[PDB]
Subunit: 127 residues, 3 copies
């Protein structure tokens, strides 16, 4: 039960850790498009989606794993009009790391912390 902490993903806005590493598997908190350096949220959904994903990647990479070890995501979104766009960025991101797509749920919620357009949690396995 190792805690994961990285500056490549935003610090906790709250009583949670960024990730926990169980040995066989890794859980991340839900990541929002907040910039780890600047604390800023990008306006466009293309960018928010790239940024949530990088934030997830930082925690998974800080555990010593890679994108291809990601087996499950939930993508929580505020607007299904943004859907094809989120999917393009998210495919590109997996393809970039030559990783097969994880299992996934995608739901439209009412609202997200800081009024972001999306939030992504992940589960990775070691082997």
């Amino acid at each position: 039960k190792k805690i994961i902490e990285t500056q490549r993903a935003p610090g906790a806005i709250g009583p949670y850790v960024q990730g926990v590493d169980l040995g066989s598997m890794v859980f991340t908190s839900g990541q929002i498009p907040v910039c780890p350096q600047t604390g800023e949220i990008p306006a466009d959904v293309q960018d928010q989606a790239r940024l949530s994903l990088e934030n997830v990647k930082a925690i998974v990479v800080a555990a010593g794993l890679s994108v291809g070890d990601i087996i499950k995501m939930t993508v929580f979104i505020t607007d299904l009009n943004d859907f094809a766009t989120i999917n393009e960025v998210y495919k590109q991101f997996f393809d970039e790391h030559q990783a097969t797509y994880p299992t996934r749920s995608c739901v439209q919620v009412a609202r997200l912390p800081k009024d972001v357009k999306l939030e992504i949690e992940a589960i990775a396995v070691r082997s």
Copy 2:
């Protein structure tokens, strides 16, 4: 990590796989009431509820497992007034397969992919 692929469940409409088998645990994507043979979404909530659960079954069977191996489900729905009808179908489903009911979370979201009334993810264990 072994990807699960079956034609008894709908082909992914985006960058995901229907299931992943970790040896120990199997994760499904969130199953919506899309008909694997036609692409149709049934109109009635009873039929939609029945149909997500058959899609979940289909992926868990393809992994070599069965419905009584499911330990967790998350049921995302668009209307809590549909709950008693969803509960009836879902109870019958597990009862039919002589299955112990899993842990479950049920929440009403704003909207789902393809304007479906529910989306169900499952987690199963091998032994």
Copy 3:
């Protein structure tokens, strides 16, 4: 294992789910709502609701033989983010009082929850 968890210190399952499942290495709970197990009532105030959801989570993990410090992931479904700073405070004090490290978390505002409660919380805990 696939052991069902059953406790009277959390509200009983009336419906097609069980309170929790113990798998050996990990415990999963059902989503817990702020329904009081003795009175069957929902407190009106979100701090009370938050505290109670957490109690209800604790009851089931503890019935599994584990403790709060073993909880490794939560998802907090809420109906109003305006309640969030308040829920966070209650949630923090709950972990601090158990001397527990904070789990991983996801928090979203959904449209609605069972019984019009203000939050539902599910938990994943590991044995060691």
